[PDB]
Each structure stands twice: as C-alpha cells, then as structure tokens.
Design a protein around this ligand. Structure first.
Ligand SMILES: [Mg+2]
Ligand SMILES: [Mg+2]
Ligand SMILES: [Mg+2]
Ligand SMILES: [Mg+2]
Ligand SMILES: [Mg+2]
Ligand SMILES: [Mg+2]
Ligand SMILES: [Mg+2]
Ligand SMILES: [Mg+2]
Ligand SMILES: [Mg+2]
Ligand SMILES: [Mg+2]
Ligand SMILES: [Mg+2]
Ligand SMILES: [Mg+2]
Lengths: 52, 51, 108, 324, 115, 95, 100
RNA sequence: ACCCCUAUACCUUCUGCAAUGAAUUAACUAGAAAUAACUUUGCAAGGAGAGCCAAAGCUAAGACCCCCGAAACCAGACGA
RNA sequence: CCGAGCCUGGUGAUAGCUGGUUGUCCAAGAUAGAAUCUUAGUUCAACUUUAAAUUUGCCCACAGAACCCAAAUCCCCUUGUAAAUUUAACUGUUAGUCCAAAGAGGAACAGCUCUUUGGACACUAGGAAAAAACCUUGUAGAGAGAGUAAAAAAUUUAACA
RNA sequence: ACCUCGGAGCAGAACCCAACCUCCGAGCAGUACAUGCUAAGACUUCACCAGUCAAAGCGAACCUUUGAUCCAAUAACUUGACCAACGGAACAAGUUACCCUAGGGAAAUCCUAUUCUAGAGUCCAUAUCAACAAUAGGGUUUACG
C-alpha cells in the first residue's frame, strides 16, 4: 500500500509538506518549492504520518 | 392576417412603454396618507351637548 | 438539433466502414533466391495493384525453410474484371525480372 | 419532427455505397486544405463568418528560365541548398510588375480607402518613393505601412518617382483632435513639373506629424495624383482640417490617384516641440482607459461568497467612521 | 404525455371555397377581430387559461376587439377551440369623435355609428 | 434555546454559534468552510483554496443566528486593529 | 448531473460565465470561448453567444482524430457545433487626461 | 297545517363518503412570551431618569406563541 | 383491579399519539424537492400571506441547442398584456385521490409500484339515475324577466337452381 | 442482500426525473512535487452543508472514486480512528402468548360448457366422446432476493 509522509525542507526552514509513497519504496528525497526561501530546495522524508 | 410579422414589429411600442410607465408610477407613488389637525380635533365632538 | 434543418450535419460514422463475375481471394506467392529481388518485385506488384485500384489486404511472408534459403512473399488480391484479370496477369508475366516463381493460389 | 435541410447537406454528394472503392484522405494536410476550402465556401447555415466578418514577355520568361536551368552552377547551388537571390533586383522587379496590387491590398487592410474615399478604391500605378532625410548621410524611407518617428519626419521628405503633371498630398488619417472623421493635411504640392518637386505649388506649408502622447499610432498617407491641367486651389488646425473625400470630389475630373505611400507615427519629443513652438498650444495627453470591471448587482446577503465580495463594491479603501 | 399542440400551418391557409363560404376577401383583409369566449377554461390547460386572461376573454359571450396581426393571431390559435372569431365590419368607417358615444355593435359584427 | 433563563429571566445565547460565526454589524454572518482542515493531502488546490475562504451566510441562516444570539453580540465594537472593520458596513447597496 | 447549455444563442454573457457544461464534446469552443478541465465551455469575453456549424480540423497531436480523418473519403469534411462569444464592448477608449 | 316541488343530519379524522363524539338543559370549560420587524408618538447625531444602543438612531407603546388524557419512574410513608 | 401493592409527593411527569380548541363580516389562499434512529414528526426549499422598494415580467416569430445512429422542450424581438423581481416579517400545507396521455419495474397487453405532461378534487352551479375525479359552467345580492350550455342509445340475421 | 459515491440501462429532442430496480467499480491507483499563490465572473445533484469551472495577475517550470462537527496529536504547517446505518448518537443485543399504554387498520395459468373437425368412435366424424386453438362463464397469480 501507500503511506503519507512528511517531507521536511533541507534548507533549514520549518517548512514541511505531505506526500504519498509506497511503504516498500525507499525513503524519499525530492526537489520542491520553498515558499519562505522562494526557491526550489531539497526535502527529505522525516517520519511516517499514516498508512493509507 | 392584416399586417405581416415584420410590419407589426414595434408598431405598439410607444403605447406599451407609456402603459408600463403608468404602472411604474402607480407602483412608486405608494406612501402613507396625510394627517390633519382637523381630523384629530374633530374627535372632541363626541362630548358636544346642548347648553 | 433534431428539429433543425442542420440536423446530422456532424455525423461521420456513415462515412467510415470499419469491419458481374468476379474472382475470390487471390494469393500471389513469390519465392526467390534474393531478399532484395523478392522485396523489389513485391513493391513493384503492390504499386501496380494500388495504381490499378486493386483491393490489397496483406503483403506478409512465409517462414524461411532450409534444406541456402529461399525467401517467400505473399500478395493478397481481391476484385478482378474479365479483361482486367487478363491484363494484370499478362503484365506480371512480362514484368517478372529473373528466375522468380509466381502463383495464383487461393486461401487455405 | 424533422425540418428538411435548406440546401445541400455537406458530404452528401459523395455519399455512396462504394466506400471501399472511394479514395480516402491518406494524409492530414489534404484534409486540412479541403476543410479550409469548405470554410471559405458560403453556406446556408449559421457560420463564424456571418458574425465575425505580353506573349513576347511569356516567351522571354520561358527562355530565361531555360537559361537559368541550363546554368550548371545554379543547379549545383540549388541541389546543395546554398544559392541565394538578389533582394534589391527582386524588389525593383516586383515593384514594376505586381507591386501596385500588393500596395492596394495594404491600403485596404489599413483602411485608407474606406477612410479617405468612403470605400472607393484604386491602384497605385506609379512606384512612388518618399524618404525623410535623417541628418545628412541617410534618409529613412516611407514604404506602404512603414514606421517613422516624428523626429525623423520633422523636415519635408525627398520624393522620387519615375514618371512624367503631379499633385502630392500628405494627410494624417487619424490625427484629428476634435472631429473623429476629419483629418489634418500636412503638406501639399500641386502642379509638379515632371519629376522635380522643388517647383511645386506649396499651397499649404509643410507640417511635421504630431500624434498626441498615449493617443496610439497614427497612419499618415502620401497621395500622388496624375494631373491633366493645372487648377487654382482654394499653422492653424481649423484650416489644416479637411476631408480627402470631398477634396478629391472637387478635383476628380482632372486628377486621378496613381501613387500611395503610408507610414505609422508614434509619440516623440519632436511632437512636444511641434505642439509648443509653432502650434502654440498645450499638447494633449491621452491615456487608454479600459471600461470598469463588471460586477453583478450587490446582494444584501452574498451567500457563499468570500469576504472579498464587499471589497468588490466598496469605493474608498480608507477607513470611514460615519457619525463618529 | 399531454403537451401544447402545434397546429400545422396548412390549417390556416384558406381555400377559395372557404372564401366563398365565409365572405372574407384574402386581399384587403379585415383589420380587427371580434373574439368572444364561448367555452369554459375549466378543464383546460393553464396555458389556455393564461391566454384567455391575456386576451381579456374572462367573461363569456362578451365581445372583445383585437388586432388581426400575427402575434394576436398566434394567441387566438392557441385558444381557438374556446372562442368565436368574427371580423369587425365598419360599414360607415371607424366612428368619429362626434359620434363616438353613439355606436353599437350589431350581432352581425358591424359597428354602426347610429343607435 | 433558552428564551427565559431561570435565574435572570433573560434570553440566552447559543455559544455554539459564537464559537463558529463572526457577525458583521450590518447583519452579515461570516464563517469558515466545513472540512477546511480535514485531509488536505487528498484535495485539489482549487478545492483547498475554496475551503480556506471566509464565507457569508444565507438570509435564513443569518436570521437563525440572529435569533440564537442576544443583542450583546450585535453591537458596535471598536476594536483596535480589527481585520473586519471595513467589512462591518455595507456601501453602495441598492435594496 | 444538471449538465447542458446554460446560455442559449443571443444571450448576453459576461466574461467568465459558463456557457455549457458537457460530458463529451457536444459543443466545441469557438471564438472567445474557453474550455475547462471538465470540458465546460465558458466565455472569455463579454458579448453575445452564437452557435454555428464549422469544419472540424483536429489538432495533429490528437492521434485518434487524425486516424479518423485519414480513414475518411477524399471529399468528406467533418462538421461540429461551435459556440462563439461576439464581443460587445471595445477593449477601451482613449481619453484626454491632461492638456500639458 | 298536511297533501305539491326541492332537499344524502352536525362535529372531528381520513385523499373523499365510512368511522369518532354528542339524551337534553343550565353553569363552568381551552393562545400565556421573546428575537426581530411593522405602525404611531417623542427627541434627534444623538436617544434613554446611570448601566445600553447609535454610520438615523434611540426611547415608549401597540400586535404574536392553547386545553384535557397514559402506561410509567423515583422518594418517603402506610398496609400480612 | 399484582409480570410486581397502595397512598402522598416530585407532578400541571412526559406523550412526534387521540380528542377538544367558544362573537360577526370581508379578503388573499393548494400537493411540491432534500435531509433526518426518518417516512404518524421536523428543518430547509417550493408554495402561501402582509408590508415595502424598484423595473420589467409572462406569452412568444424567426435564429439557435450532438454525435453515437414521436408528442414535444428550452431560449426571446414583437405583441397581447400587468405583472415581476427585490427588501422586511411570517405562519401553515407539503412521503395525497381520481381521470387523459407517454414510459419504465425481466423484450410482464390486463392488475399493481413508480416516473413524467396535463386536468379535476379537496370551492359554485347545471347535467350524466343515484354520483368527490365524466360533460357544461364558474366571483358571489334581489327579481313572479330573457337567450343559451351540457343533456334523449342503438339494433332483429340463414329457402332454393 | 442493500444503505455513500461514481459510470451505464432510464427516460428518443434544455434540465429534472422510471424511486423501488439491473449491471459495473471506488473507498483508489498512476503521475507530478508550482500537479503553486492569488483572483473577475459563473455552474451546481432541485434547501443548506458540500461539490465544480475559471479569465486577468504573481511565481515556478517549459493530471487521468468518497465522510461534517466535536475531540485528540503536532511548535506550527498539518495529521488521525470512528463515523460504511456513509448529514455521522462517543460508548447499548436478543425476547415478551405474562405483557401494559397511546393510537391506526381490517396479462398468464387453471377449471367448466359450446364452436373447427384433429381424431377416437366395430368401418363409418357429427349415435357418443374428444385434442390444439377460438368463444364465452367461473376461480388463482403477479414487478420481484
Ligand atoms: Mg355515542
Ligand atoms: Mg394473619
Ligand atoms: Mg389491591
Ligand atoms: Mg400534556
Ligand atoms: Mg376568496
Ligand atoms: Mg443518524
Ligand atoms: Mg413521528
Ligand atoms: Mg444514473
Ligand atoms: Mg445548488
Ligand atoms: Mg443512518
Ligand atoms: Mg444517512
Ligand atoms: Mg407461564
């Protein structure tokens, strides 16, 4: 199944956004727009929010 | 028919507009009626007697 | 709209067909020593067919057989008139380049 | 119920049972060409258009083409896709041959005919040339629809045309400031002897173009009329205003248009100079004002509307306090 | 379902036999209808009831004069089974202001300026 | 609601209304959209934008809320930096 | 579903008004008519709504429509119903703001 | 007076006639109120006899929210 | 008068259920969707009433509304008309009956269960025998005047070259 | 068995509707991580709640099937189970003939007799009986797992 995860910005900001990834799939690292920084920055998966 | 559909177009428009103007005037002229000191004071006559 | 004179102005499926002595299905089998020669003759006969307005269905090939190898080709043909079949076959006969085997065999 | 079609239904003439025997659109482009043809063709149904609407010369041409083909160098360059074409020679040849027709198309597109002669057209037979001398070393030309600044058009232009009398006129079809239909004449030479222009009768002196700021782009037309016999004719706007329509009505018996060349003028500092120095008046400034945005009639209860609904109808953004 | 009835136009195309029968000339047609309601609007559709009210035929057997023009005629066609239509005939022409108060609608359909 | 309280004899306010709706003085009631904080990960950006909005109530909804609150909640409040100060009054309204 | 035409021919329409809601492409966008993600037709300008029949030339990237059009006889032309908005007001006017 | 002609009791509940209630008389026997509104006064950017409301409002008055009936439940007594 | 005594009190228990709800006169006044531990109720909508503001409202001639592959409906210039919309306030009715018509409930003629269009009944009178639903007809009183509307069932047959 | 939603029948031509009913699938999957932010004007499952589309603008790049409130958790942004009886009581089943109260109410598929004569009837129809059908008369059943 899929799990909702909290991608947390690697830019030092507290900005986090939620994505969906397969449980069997590896932890996610993804480029995403940082509104506070106003630039695309890397985000890393921190913790599993739920299992959907 | 006496007139055709093209001939009749607009031949009564002025009268229809005036009639609706009258209807609108009646609708917008609604207001409470006047009140008269004579009407208020005439009620004193309920105790009019013969001296 | 149904009641309007322009009803059905947008219909198209009637223009798409998705599915007097005349022949049936005709198979022309071309066995040849040369891939290039067989392919060229198949192209030539296909061009003759589609220039003479012949319904050509398939242009496939048989699997190769080894006992050197001989390449096989098939041309499918449907729709022939009395004189049209004669002229078509005689043109094929006079246009066979070199050492190729024709056929007028049928299906199955 | 079914009302019969009011004409030939499309795809009815070819509607036949021999679909397999009917040649088909093997390609998209052939269908596109057919569809464009059909769209151009008139129809009995409602359509988008309804609402939004010598022999020796031939022989010489054939021989010249044969010579060019025979030239092996030309074939080698063409097959190597490296050949080129003399633009100046092609320009001159086109001007002589079919340039007047293209210039008539340009005039019709720019609305010169409809705005000057109320739709009456003609063909600019004379390949006129006008150019405003910029500085001293060069001169900006005035083609059919060019773009020239009033700074470059400050002084009168040099006119050349291979012909033999002539009346040359300049109008601003849309520069008028009071009456929409009228236009301003800028300079008019009459009874031009042949080609030389300095000897022309200067009835109205030369005026540079003066398109007001933010008033858009104005189209200025050089008209040239063939003249049979001279006729006596006749810095103030009331006397510079006139209509080419009735003007040429008064002279069409002996004058016939044979040349046109027009250009677009925008605002420039020279326009400030024109308005102040010699017109002696405050220059007008125009702004393109769009209509106010449409809003539906305000409701007492704007159900399901966002809070911005009230802002859509308030006029002043500053806080107000009423009686307080 | 019961719906409005679209009367085919051939119904309202008079024949020469009709012209002889009823005495109206298709050329120079009559200007005004006299319409009287002769049938109840009860048990009739609401649209017929509405047309009767619009035409002012609420009272039966009370003549009402209307224009002989296509729109009025369309309404009359909607309610033609409830009414009697007769042309208004003016043997002495339309009444003048002097005799506007001395007119009478004869049962034949003639507005006479003497009464 | 309580039309006459047992201790004062007064009409009471339904506090569920106060916890949920804002009353603009002119008579308009503002609210949030239901579900505006629920499962945002499965909602489209347009739907989320619609849900994040402050929304007016019906005439009948407003009448119900007016009945369910007392006159205290319908007074002029001159808060210091009220974001709704401009919205407290209607302008250019015809009937 | 409550789908269908919301603005019939001749109806005045303001920019943004939905003209017709549809599941398929029963009506196609004409002049000044945009399409939503769900094939809804909305007005891009303020004006009068007109319905016409026009020759249909599908976008080349539309593979299915291109195949349909290539399988078509040499004289046939496809037609579709299009919705246009005939703009009423001009884009704007030039007004005298200052006599410098 | 009757004879003539016309005339399918009342209430309530049913979609509508069947069903409900009524021997009859007298007496008794059942629409209680706020949020707003509206109307009429007063005063008016203020009204109100503290408090409250006010971007024409405020104050006052006028108008509007029935009767009978369970099986029950609990508490405390009284009863072999 | 015990599947749980009796009395008093809480208690004017509660009752979406039943019954009742008292002067005169006039006027406007009709079937209708959604949700609901909901279908014996209620709330919103629709309708309805009052007051108010304003300007258009209804009818509709063309034009217009899809391919797949019928009757009609929508929309609105005229026109006939006088209403409609909005504002304020508000109760009550609303999971009906019958008739005409078109359909679905398995490719179910009738019966039923529903959907849709229209009419009627819950509102007067005349007629059809009596008569809620068929026909005629409605706006109100008095008359010892008059013209009409609907309104009356039909039918009686077997020789034979 | 179903209860919510979506697609098709099922409505021939705006919408709405044949509820009940028939079939199918969804409580998503894939993709992207501007698949952002804002904002005119509109649609709408006949209320509301909710649900859709969207110009212009700003910013990056250069989409195709559901569930409210409260309450919890999270610094917050946000997230969660139950509500599937899917407008959702936070947590409650069987049973009463021992019961009480308040009320409401009470075409096809079968048979009989004639008709056509199929035919039985010793052969022979019409002495007698009689098939399928038709005619009448009587009774039963229904659209619903
Ligand atoms: Mg009794
Ligand atoms: Mg004892
Ligand atoms: Mg005892
Ligand atoms: Mg009680
Ligand atoms: Mg009445
Ligand atoms: Mg519930
Ligand atoms: Mg109940
Ligand atoms: Mg469906
Ligand atoms: Mg809606
Ligand atoms: Mg439930
Ligand atoms: Mg539910
Ligand atoms: Mg026992």
């Amino acid at each position: 199944k899929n799990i909702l995860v909290r991608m947390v910005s690697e830019a030092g900001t507290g900005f986090c956004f939620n994505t969906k990834r397969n449980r069997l799939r590896e932890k996610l690292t993804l480029l995403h727009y940082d509104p506070v920084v106003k630039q695309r920055v890397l985000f890393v998966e921190k913790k599993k929010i739920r299992s959907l | 028919p006496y007139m055709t559909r093209e001939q009749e177009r607009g031949h009564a428009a002025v009268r229809r507009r005036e009639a609706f103007e009258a209807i609108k005037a009646a609708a917008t002229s609604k207001f409470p009626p006047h009140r008269f000191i004579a009407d208020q004071l005439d009620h004193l006559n309920v105790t009019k007697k013969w001296s | 709209y149904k009641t309007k004179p322009t009803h059905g102005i947008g219909k198209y499926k009637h223009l798409i067909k998705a599915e007097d002595y005349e022949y049936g299905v005709l198979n022309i089998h071309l066995t040849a020593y040369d891939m290039t020669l067989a392919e060229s003759y198949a192209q030539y006969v296909h061009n003759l067919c589609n220039s003479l307005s012949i319904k050509v269905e398939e242009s496939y090939a048989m699997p190769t057989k080894t006992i050197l190898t001989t390449h096989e080709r098939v041309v499918q043909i449907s729709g022939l008139s009395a004189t049209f079949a004669e002229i078509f076959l005689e043109i094929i006969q006079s246009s066979l380049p070199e050492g190729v085997r024709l056929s007028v065999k049928e299906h199955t | 119920r079914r009302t019969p079609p009011l004409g030939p239904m499309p795809n009815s003439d070819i509607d036949l049972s021999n679909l397999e025997r009917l040649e088909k659109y093997r390609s998209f482009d052939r269908y596109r060409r057919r569809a464009e043809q059909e769209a151009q063709a008139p129809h009995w149904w409602r359509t988008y258009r309804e609402y939004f609407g010598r022999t020796q010369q031939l022989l010489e041409r054939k021989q010249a083409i044969q010579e060019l083909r025979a030239n092996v160098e030309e074939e080698r360059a063409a097959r190597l896709r490296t050949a080129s074409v003399p633009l100046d020679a092609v320009r001159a040849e086109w001007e002589r041959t079919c340039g007047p027709y293209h210039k008539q198309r340009l005039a019709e597109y720019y609305g010169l005919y409809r705005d000057l002669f109320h739709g009456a057209t003609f063909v600019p037979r004379v390949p006129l040339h006008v150019a405003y001398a910029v500085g001293e070393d060069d001169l900006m030309p005035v083609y059919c629809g060019n773009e020239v600044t009033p700074t470059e058009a400050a002084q009168a232009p040099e006119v050349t045309y291979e012909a033999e009398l002539w009346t040359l006129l300049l109008t601003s079809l849309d520069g008028h400031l009071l009456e929409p239909d009228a236009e301003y004449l800028h300079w008019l030479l009459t009874n031009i002897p042949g080609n030389r222009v300095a000897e022309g009768q200067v009835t109205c002196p030369y005026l540079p173009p003066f398109p007001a700021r933010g008033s858009g782009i104005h189209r200025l037309a050089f008209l040239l009329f063939k003249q049979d016999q001279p006729i006596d004719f006749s810095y103030q706007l009331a006397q510079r205003t006139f209509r080419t329509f009735d003007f040429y009505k008064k002279h069409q018996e002996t004058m016939t248009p044979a040349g046109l060349s027009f250009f677009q003028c925008r605002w420039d500092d020279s326009v400030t100079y024109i308005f102040h120095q010699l017109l002696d008046m405050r220059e007008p400034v125009f702004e393109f004002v769009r209509p106010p945005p449409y809003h539906p009639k305000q409701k007492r209860f704007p159900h399901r509307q966002p809070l911005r609904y009230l802002d859509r109808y308030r006029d002043s953004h500053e806080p107000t306090y009423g009686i307080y | 379902k019961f719906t409005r009835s679209r009367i085919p136009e051939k119904v309202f195309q008079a024949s020469p036999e009709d012209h002889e029968k009823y005495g109206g000339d298709p050329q120079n047609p009559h200007k005004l209808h006299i319409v009287t309601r002769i049938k109840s609007t009860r048990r009739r559709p609401y649209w017929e009831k509405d047309i009767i009210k619009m035409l002012g035929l609420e009272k039966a057997h009370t003549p009402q004069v209307h224009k002989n023009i296509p729109s009025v005629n369309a309404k009359l066609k909607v309610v033609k089974h409830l009414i009697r239509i007769k042309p208004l005939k003016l043997p002495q022409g339309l009444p003048a202001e002097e005799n506007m108060s001395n007119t009478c609608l004869k049962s034949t359909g003639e507005l006479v300026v003497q009464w | 609601l309580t039309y006459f309280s047992a201790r004062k004899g007064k009409r009471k306010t339904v506090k569920a209304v106060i916890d949920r709706f804002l009353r603009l003085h002119c008579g308009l009631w503002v609210r949030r959209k239901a579900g505006y904080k629920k499962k945002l990960w499965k909602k489209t950006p347009a739907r989320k934008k619609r849900l994040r909005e402050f929304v007016f109530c019906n005439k009948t909804q407003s009448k119900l809320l007016d009945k369910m609150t007392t006159s205290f909640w319908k007074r002029r409040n001159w808060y210091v930096d009220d974001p709704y100060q401009k919205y407290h009054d209607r302008t250019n309204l015809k009937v | 579903r409550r789908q269908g035409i919301k603005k019939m021919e001749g109806h005045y329409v303001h920019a943004g008004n939905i003209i017709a809601t549809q599941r398929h492409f029963r009506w196609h966008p004409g002049a000044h008519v945009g399409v939503g993600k769900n094939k809804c037709l909305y007005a891009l300008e303020e004006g009068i709504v007109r319905y016409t029949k026009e020759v249909y030339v599908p976008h080349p990237r539309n593979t299915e429509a291109v195949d349909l059009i290539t399988r078509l006889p040499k004289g046939a032309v496809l037609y579709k119903t299009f919705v246009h908005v005939v703009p009423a007001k001009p884009e704007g006017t030039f007004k005298l703001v200052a006599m410098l």
